[PDB]
Design a protein around this ligand. Structure first.
Ligand code: NAD
Ligand code: NAD
Lengths: 460, 460
């Protein structure tokens, strides 16, 4: 059993092999595409209010399996159990939210054409192929699947190969809810299987959450096949603290933003950009708060951090730490792989990080904070924008006039002023630059995979 | 002078070489990108009401050169002069329409977040690279440039190599209007130059109007570079006539839809799908009406059709005609290349066209109507959707409820019921399947190239 023939689940806290699953064969892929096509054909004809009711059924079936799902998330990728439980609750609440607010967003639009001759309709597009990651194994699927299916599309999940136990449980939830065959489906396809599906006429569009490299590989294939794609490819979000900040609130938001989900968050606070006058006080408070975080067995609710999800990615992250230290940064906390069977990396703080260093230019997808000193607010904006990424950003300053101006100039898709960054059904999510393009949640996640259709009567 | 080194204009009505222009060099490309970056940096700071006034200045500058522009359009690609004049009028009115209605579409959205803490802002993305075709040398450019620039983006035009006289005149109009260099810019880039610009960080996104082959080549590169693209790649629009249609109006709309711009329209009526009871009457009327169209010198206003734009594309169209005849269709009108120096192809009607034939499966980008018989309305819908394309469609029937149900089942981005298909600033434009993805005009054209940005204050 090698990762060249199988999807493999390993518990990152213990090292034990949980499950293996061979890649989908040519028959498996063809069967899934046939059922997706048949399911979409029938699903697109359903009434919107019936689909809204089915979303609520998904929410009930998810809550009914809430602890089983949370434990599967924790077991396969190491997330603290209360964060996994929160992920389940957030995902079930998303079902109910789109059931209530989604239908109105799909109503026909009036136009300025005289005599009400023309309207805009939001029609289903087809089956959307979804390529998803391990860090929120449930929420990442539901964030797209819920509005996509509400809009009359089908959804075909290609999940990360280390969370196929989560993928099977999600399928069971959709089965429990009575979602027809082919409307929600999933496949353990290897990269070639994905390539084959992108080229297949029964896949209408593609959505990807993952690495920049995956986004570039899949986006190129989608474009070559004339398939629209949405790409969410991670981030290196700046977290700016100016001299007049509420320092106690800023440190709390800084610690939560960097170290939630053991740092494995696309929109984690990854680059702390601190104005010079407050930098010493921020750094000392931040290091002390990070050092008080309890880490260990993620089934134990006293622990705020678990192990990292993937052994090879802990090696990558530690290598990023070593290079950054070799480049001249200072190690203030952590910075060594923990011995033992678990994939643990301690909360880590690097300081004296300059724009040329590895921890400033690459996504640090684990519990490693990078602290950079800014000379003033204009330098802080320049440092914040000096990134290939552009997902989200935080600004802490009590000057509301300065905050709003920096938001208008921050090169990212979401700006949080004096608060905690998060994704939320009620607001758009997604970024710019190498973080990708397209928007999820609110009405944006509904409409991205609609056929927006002008219907015009009696144009004579 | 060779096609490997130069853009070349030839008058299709006479075969006379008009002009040549060498491809941009490395220095030209870098200068255009530097201008674009400097122009966007300043333009994004302007007030939206200022930009709206600048749109009005564009409309004024364009009308002031309306006849110079129209004659250049007709001279370079063969369009009947009054259709070229109408193209100018429609483009100038688009400037005024977006100046009046655009700014309100760019206001921040409220959200359902508590305490009015979060809004959605529509920020510009950057410089949009636009790859455009020769069939509407002005309107294709303005359709995107006007909303793109209004949203605070820059626009960098790579026009079709046979209309660089048009491209130069468009640049002069923007300069007459006082639109800064780089905010509207253009380059005579070859394909490699386009590839270099797509990879350059000073290009934020790409928009393409052209062939399926061009959209696949460019879309693949945009995806590989993590740049959003919008693709409009032509169509094979069905035109459905049921037994209860207003037959006189249906034939008029049928003829106008197929033969406008000598057939060279993405959203032309290309596949006529006629219910069996009315098929003989429709076909007789349609052949007679098409045979009454005058073709010749497009400077002479008595002509409804001109020569086709490109000699090689007349050859391609006639090859598609010959293959369709060889497969079993019946030639009712035209069907032969005219002798002489001009690139003339007569109005042509193919009957007994089945879904397996070349004229049913490929885009027929010239004055060639295909007529297919449908047994009933359900067969008509199946025939209409049996296409790799999906741009627009027409339904003629007095059963207004049947029309509405068929529209909800047509796999295309626009459906015209008992009327003339057209693009219009007030409604969405763009299709599905191999016709591409993304939407132009109305608020869609403004928002496709925005950074849709969540700004959320005090999330604590
Ligand atoms: N944006 C995010 O939420 C997110 C999530 C996980 C990882 N990441 C980033 O990616 C890095 C690596 O983690 P990863 O290896 O799991 O990321 P990954 O991109 O390799 O995995 C993401 C998903 O894309 C699929 N995938 C990757 N390459 C593919 C290809 N060529 N064809 C088809 N499918 C393909 C994977 O199977 C998985 O389902 C992390 O350190 C982090 O920086 C980002
Ligand atoms: N959608 C439309 O409105 C439209 C317009 C013109 C042509 N077409 C279709 O395309 C057929 C051929 O006409 P055409 O040869 O002018 O189409 P074309 O796609 O080759 O030309 C379209 C534009 O794209 C550019 N282009 C093409 N390939 C490119 C590449 N690889 N890299 C960079 N730029 C590239 C061309 O220079 C031109 O500016 C027509 O017969 C018709 O079927 C469609």
């Amino acid at each position: 059993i090698t990762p060249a023939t199988h999807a493999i689940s390993i518990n990152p806290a213990t090292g034990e092999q949980l499950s293996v699953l061979p890649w989908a064969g040519a028959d498996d892929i063809e069967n899934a595409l046939q059922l997706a096509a048949a399911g979409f054909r029938d699903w697109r004809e359903t009434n919107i209010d019936y689909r809204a009711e089915k979303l609520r059924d998904i929410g009930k079936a998810l809550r009914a399996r809430s602890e089983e799902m949370a434990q599967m998330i924790t077991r396969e990728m190491g997330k603290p159990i209360n964060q996994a439980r929160a992920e389940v609750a957030k995902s079930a609440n998303l079902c109910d939210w789109y059931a209530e607010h989604g239908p109105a967003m799909l109503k026909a639009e009036p136009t300025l054409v005289e005599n009400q001759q023309a309207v805009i309709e939001y029609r289903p597009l087809g089956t959307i192929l979804a390529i998803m990651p391990w860090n929120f194994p449930l929420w990442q699927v539901m964030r797209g699947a819920v509005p996509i299916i509400l809009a009359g599309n089908g959804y075909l999940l290609k999940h990360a190969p280390n969370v196929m136990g989560c993928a099977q449980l999600i399928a069971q939830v959709f089965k429990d809810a009575g979602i027809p065959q082919g409307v929600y489906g999933w496949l353990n396809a290897d990269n070639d299987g994905v390539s084959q599906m992108i080229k297949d006429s029964r896949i209408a569009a593609v959505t990807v959450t993952g690495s920049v490299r995956a986004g570039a590989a899949i986006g190129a294939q989608a474009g070559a096949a004339l398939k629209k794609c949405v790409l969410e490819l991670g981030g290196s979000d700046p977290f700016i603290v100016l001299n007049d900040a509420d320092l106690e609130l800023a440190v709390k938001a800084a610690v939560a933003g960097r170290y939630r989900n053991t740092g494995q968050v696309c929109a984690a606070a990854k680059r702390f950009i601190i104005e010079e006058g407050i930098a010493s006080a921020f750094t000392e408070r931040f290091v002390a708060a990070a050092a008080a975080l309890k880490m260990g067995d993620p089934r134990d609710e006293e622990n705020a951090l678990g192990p990292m999800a993937r052994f090879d990615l802990r090696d990558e992250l530690h290598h990023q730490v070593e290079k950054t230290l070799a480049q001249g940064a200072r190690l203030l906390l952590g910075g060594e792989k923990m011995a033992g069977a678990g994939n643990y990396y301690p909360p880590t703080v690097l300081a004296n990080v300059t724009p040329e260093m590895t921890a400033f230019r690459e996504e640090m997808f684990g519990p490693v904070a990078a602290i950079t000193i800014a000379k003033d607010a204009e330098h802080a904006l320049e440092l914040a924008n000096d990134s290939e990424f552009g997902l989200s950003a935080t600004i802490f300053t009590t000057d509301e006039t300065q905050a709003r101006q920096m938001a208008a100039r921050l090169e990212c898709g979401g700006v949080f002023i004096n608060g905690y960054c998060a994704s939320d059904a009620r607001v758009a999510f997604g970024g710019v630059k190498k973080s990708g393009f397209g928007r999820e949640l609110s009405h944006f996640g509904l409409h991205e995979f609609c056929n927006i259709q002008t219907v015009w009567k009696d144009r004579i």
